[PDB]
Design a protein around this nucleic acid. Structure first.
Ligand SMILES: Nc1ccn([C@H]2C[C@H](O)[C@@H](COP(=O)(O)NP(=O)(O)OP(=O)(O)O)O2)c(=O)n1
Ligand SMILES: [Mg+2]
Ligand code: NA
Ligand code: NA
Length: 327
DNA sequence: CCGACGACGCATCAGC
DNA sequence: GCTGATGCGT
DNA sequence: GTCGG
């Protein structure tokens, strides 16, 4: 639909969601508020009453009353209060620093650290991740236009083919689905000499090559299969330098690759929905494998998979190309 | 009345 | 030193 | 907070 339909409500709910997550540490309330925010945002009518909203799946008694108060007044008493509160809003803001979750956020505020100024004053108290997350607080919230994503793909695909001819690299996420802008870069990676029954340097080599040509600039986390770091396009001539971007690189076994590709292509709203349909039909899908569900609920062995299409050729559905996986 | 609610890799932490 | 728990991002 | 056992 349109934002301004029930945008006031969805915003109200989203604000509520973030406070539950970051201040109350109630993750399931946070997901509840979001589920309501989503189902309402897709509801093609202007909500007249909280009772009208209650009819939707995921909207219950509490939110219904919250909508009554909002429609009748244009705001929420509890929300205006938590906004003006120094301690709760400070906690809520710090979690925007990647690396700082709700726990570390409350630690800082409890000992008097409430702002980025305070953080920068006390960098010794921060761990590695939090220093990077703070360093690029600005950049990490900027979006990435597809144009810059394509150039990034160019480098990633080239540097990967340069390390070993037989690597298979795929940029997934919203990029693959076609989104004109993206929040980060999701790279998926495999290699013929890595399977379920199979060097612990396959991911390392790729990462360090991307470091040598100065694409990857910082490291948040690196293991044998998963990489989280930062990357930056080379500056264009006169033009002012590019923002630093988040990049993830995952090394997946060859036989688990297309399940992984399917999963990290998304959207999560699409995934969450393919999983059930998969259920209905007697199949369970994760990021690793698709497995048949038996008489009881017993999982047999994972079926052979050689394409995304193969996976639809188990739940008897016809291909939906990444372009249309909006949800 | 009450439990589920998504689950996993990696970094640091609690503890032995 | 180690194992296991917790926090974190996603 | 919502849904459903
Ligand atoms: N909480 C989440 C969110 C997404 N995912 C999955 C499905 C996503 O499409 C895929 C990549 O995650 P992502 O980078 O956060 N989202 P996506 O690329 O689809 O959109 P952006 O915000 O990155 O532009 O992993 C997940 O496993 N757990
Ligand atoms: Mg992405
Ligand atoms: Na309802
Ligand atoms: Na954060």
């Amino acid at each position: 639909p349109q934002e301004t339909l029930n945008g006031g409500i969805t915003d109200m709910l989203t604000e509520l969601a973030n406070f539950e997550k970051n201040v109350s540490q109630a993750i399931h309330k946070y997901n509840a508020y979001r589920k309501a925010a989503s189902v309402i945002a897709k509801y093609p009518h202007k909500i007249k009453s909280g009772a009208e909203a209650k009819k939707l799946p995921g909207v219950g008694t509490k939110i219904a009353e919250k909508i009554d108060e909002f429609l009748a007044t244009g705001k929420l008493r509890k929300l205006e209060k938590i906004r003006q509160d120094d301690t709760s809003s400070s906690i809520n803001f710090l979690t925007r620093v990647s690396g700082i979750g709700p726990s570390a956020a409350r630690k800082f505020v409890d000992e008097g650290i409430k702002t980025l100024e305070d953080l920068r004053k006390n960098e010794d108290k921060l761990n590695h991740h939090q220093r990077i997350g703070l360093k690029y607080f600005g950049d990490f919230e900027k979006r990435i236009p597809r144009e810059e994503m394509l150039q990034m793909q160019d480098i990633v695909l080239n540097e990967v083919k340069k390390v070993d001819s037989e690597y298979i690299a795929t940029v997934c996420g919203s990029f693959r689905r076609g989104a004109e802008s993206s929040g980060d870069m999701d790279v998926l990676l495999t290699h013929p000499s890595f399977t379920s029954e199979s060097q612990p340097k396959l991911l390392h080599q790729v990462v360090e090559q991307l470091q040598k040509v100065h694409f990857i600039t910082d490291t948040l986390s690196k293991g044998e299969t998963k990489f989280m770091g930062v990357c930056q396009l080379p500056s264009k001539n006169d033009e002012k330098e590019y923002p630093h971007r988040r990049i993830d690189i995952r090394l997946i076994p060859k036989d688990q690759y297309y399940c992984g590709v399917l999963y990290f292509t998304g959207s999560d709203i699409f995934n969450k929905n393919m999983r059930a349909h998969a259920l209905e039909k007697g199949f369970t899908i994760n990021e690793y494998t698709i497995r048949p569900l038996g008489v009881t609920g017993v999982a047999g062995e994972p079926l052979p998979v050689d394409s995304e299409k193969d996976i639809f050729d188990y739940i008897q559905w016809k291909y939906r190309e990444p372009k249309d996986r909006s949800e």
